[PDB]
Design a protein around this ligand. Structure first.
Ligand SMILES: [Zn+2]
Length: 257
């Protein structure tokens, strides 16, 4: 099935998921000289006080940390959103080298990595139904650059030996996602999609202008993960990002001048 390699990477995806060639695909390039500052835009409200992380998983494409989404413990609201979106997971994408790794790009620039805090619209009852709705998901995307270390990522880095290969998971309780946010919540926003199959166009993307810094030692530990399962030839999990897709008929709004 799908991956990032020459035989099953982003250029092949459309054969199984034809929406890959659609009108609201993600990620995109964020052109800061055409993104418009938007007045109707409230500030973003991140309410992650009650967040409960469940498990971390190497799914053979990335890793995800999964969250207890049985109640309003961790919600995103405000900004461009209507209603209340519950955090269900975060996924991470990164590169083989520091100059690539992000899915979204800003003025064609690629960051070392990109995190997604994935939330589903409470009015659809669950994630399954949510993803079938054009406004069903809100994804907060945070760029990472290699500079100093992020302490709130170290928990994650420290568990990665336990999930080196596809299929492996580990308990990951009491992880605080607030520790993955930059200082500023200035953001750009646009309608798009999942960046991995099934690539459904159900996403209000909210991409933060301010990147976080991670150490070279932190990102290096992501690059030691594996795409393959235990007892298969070792294939390092790197470059698990989809490249920027056609903007087509969409405007990217900025929450800031
Ligand atoms: Zn992701």
């Amino acid at each position: 099935h799908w991956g990032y390699g020459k035989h099953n990477g982003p250029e092949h995806w459309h054969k199984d998921f034809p929406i890959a060639k659609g009108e609201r695909q993600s990620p995109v390039d964020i052109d800061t000289h055409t993104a418009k500052y938007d007045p109707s835009l409230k500030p973003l409200s991140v309410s992650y006080d009650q967040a409960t992380s469940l498990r971390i998983l190497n799914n053979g494409h990335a890793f995800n940390v999964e969250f207890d989404d049985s109640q309003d413990k961790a919600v995103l609201k405000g900004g461009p959103l209507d209603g209340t979106y519950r955090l269900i997971q975060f996924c991470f994408h990164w590169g083989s080298l520091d100059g690539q790794g992000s899915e979204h790009t800003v003025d064609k620039k690629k960051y070392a990595a990109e995190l997604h805090l994935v939330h589903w619209n409470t009015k659809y009852g669950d994630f399954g139904k949510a993803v079938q709705q054009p406004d069903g998901l809100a994804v907060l995307g945070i760029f990472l650059k290699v500079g100093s270390a992020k302490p709130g990522l170290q928990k994650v880095v420290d568990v990665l030996d336990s999930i080196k290969t596809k299929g492996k998971s580990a308990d990951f309780t009491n992880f605080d996602p607030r520790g993955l946010l930059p200082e500023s919540l200035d953001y750009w926003t646009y309608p798009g999609s999942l960046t991995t199959p099934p690539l459904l166009e159900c996403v209000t993307w909210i991409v933060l202008k301010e990147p976080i810094s991670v150490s070279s030692e932190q990102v290096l530990k992501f690059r030691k993960l594996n795409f393959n399962g235990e007892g298969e030839p070792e294939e390092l999990m790197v470059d698990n990002w989809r490249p920027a897709q056609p903007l087509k008929n969409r405007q990217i709004k900025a929450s800031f001048k």
